[PDB]
Amino acid sequence: DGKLPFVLIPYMPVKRDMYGEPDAELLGDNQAVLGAVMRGMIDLLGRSAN
Amino acid sequence: MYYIEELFCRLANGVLNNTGIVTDDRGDIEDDSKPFIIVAANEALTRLHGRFNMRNNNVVVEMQEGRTNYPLLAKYAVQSYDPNEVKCPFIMDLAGEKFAEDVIRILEVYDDKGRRRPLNDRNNPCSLFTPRPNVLQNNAPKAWEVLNVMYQAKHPKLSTAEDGYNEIDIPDTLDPALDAYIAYRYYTSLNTPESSAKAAEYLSFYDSICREVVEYDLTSDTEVDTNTLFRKRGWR
């Protein structure tokens, strides 16, 4: 072949760049917000007398 | 900020002008009845410092091994203590005014390491306890542990005796409340129906002034701060 034996496969390509972006880049804030709501619901039920 | 002498002159030329407890020239109170005003004055100042968080003071307590209860009394301070009775005082007031024994309610406790020690937390193993309002209890005194206690402090006790405390430090807007309360005790002590009706009016006036202060918030009693739970809960 006469060149490097490595192959690059990006997931979401970046304009004029090698490394792509995974799905975790866009969902950073959404996961944190969702986690806060779930913990709040459990705390309301868990700490309540029953 | 005025001395105790001006209080007698203000009362003589104020609410108590008509009564016979003042001198002929209405310039001072009789020496035979000065302690009567002092008892009322001490009572009035305690009530004001309870309703309003005017004064906040902090003390330094040095832990001593073998002792779990640390009363906040004057005789345990480094100043004005008996070396014959207590061998080593644990309350340090080396600088500034002496410890006046004016503890009402403990607010927060911080140690020398810079952290916050939980107070009256029964489920917390390392929390302090207060079996009495003016007594601080530690269940594990260490070698060099030193505690700082922030508490709501009342005004120091006034006394006409020599080398006593004879200065009044209250906000000037509460002066009418002080005079009304003192007059209330004087008139209600006469056991006279004419004076009893007058005494009730002064008590209502004292309460009216206090609620006026709360309504307009002249003492800055309220306190708010930036919310920190937003980051603690991870809302982001």
UniProtKB/Swiss-Prot annotation, chain A:
Location of this fragment in the whole protein: 358 to 407 of 763
Functional note: Forms the portal vertex of the capsid. This portal plays critical roles in head assembly, genome packaging, neck/tail attachment, and genome ejection. The portal protein multimerizes as a single ring-shaped homododecamer arranged around a central channel.
Top-level taxon of the source organism: Viruses
Subunit text: Homododecamer.
Cell compartment(s), UniProt: Virion
UniProt protein name: Probable portal protein
Name of the gene: 59
